[model samples]
Target: NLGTWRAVVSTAEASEENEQMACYFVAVSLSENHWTVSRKLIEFQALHRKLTECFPSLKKVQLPSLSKLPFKSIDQKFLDKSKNQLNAFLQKVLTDERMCQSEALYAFLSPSL
Candidate 1:
């Protein structure tokens, strides 16, 4: 019963700095007896595509789901590494209070279950 979802990016040019910054946004909705994972996965895929398409100059686009995929088999070491990397990335992308908002990802994946 997973629902449909999409990921989008908002880009704006800083006229004063003459630079561009990309902001990734995701919207998800939960249905009855549903995991709401389709949107989450789609968001991950969209982010991947955005980075590769817009910033091909970067060596890599390290995303949380990249290491957390197929979560059933995640080992402690892998979990630790993924957590650390994700935390670091979030720290840079999110404000101090917003860092805790990352937990919404997990809540969305397992709504009421």
Candidate 2:
């Protein structure tokens, strides 16, 4: 609970896809070093989708809604709130021992897989 995992949902920027994506920065402590990676909200959704498929119980878990799919240049307040909410969502997932140790989660957290 104190050191193995930690994450931060910090900012949003326009992507080459012309979509605004929030940056989800995560870190995992390995035997000798830490692994860190940043992913977009859509990637998180993909990870959740995979998780639910692997662990049907995960179907009951909820991810922060991406109310509007196509994120454009939006209000600073809205962006800020969404980042925090997404961070909260990640924290919830990390607490689940099963989901946390799943191959899907590992792939998602991997810097490159």
Candidate 3:
């Protein structure tokens, strides 16, 4: 109840400043949780590290950095491209029977499950 209600109020802000802050926070949230952050695609890099440890095959699923990240500026087109690539990659990962079967990865990917 603390902050999750933001999901119901505003699914996401279309404002550019809001989006830039989001990029900053998303970078932090995805990176600072477990270990050191890499400037390029921070959180995904960390996830790839663990996932690749036992499931080296997953290395092929690496996400492209949406921006230089945590420093470099980005605009709508950058976000648009990143969102498209992320959605497509996620779709591929979710649809592949072999990729979605692992308990660890499934848990990481599916937060509510």
lDDT of 1 at 12: 17
- TM-score ranking from best candidate downward: 2, 3, 1
Q: Model 1: residues >4 Å from true position, as ranges?
A: 1-46, 61-72, 91-113
| Model 2 lDDT per residue over 1-113, tens place | 32246666656543445465555566555431666777776788888788778877866766655555565554556556767666776676777877777677667766775
lDDT for each residue of candidate 1 in 1-113, tens digit (9 for 90 to 100) = 22222212212111212322111223333322222222322344454454346446322546545333332343444434443443343333333233224444344333343
TM-score, prediction 3:
0.45
Clashing pairs in 3: none
- Across 1-113, the per-residue lDDT of candidate 3 in tens digits comes to 11111101111112334233323112112211322111223443555566578767877875655444445555656545554444454455545565556554444343231
Question: How many steric overlaps are in each model, in order?
Answer: 0, 0, 0
Q: After superposition, how far is residue 105 of candidate 3 from its true place, in Å?
A: 4.0
* Predictions: Cα RMSD each: 16.4, 3.7, 10.6
**Comparing candidate 1 with candidate 2, which one achieves the higher TM-score?**
2
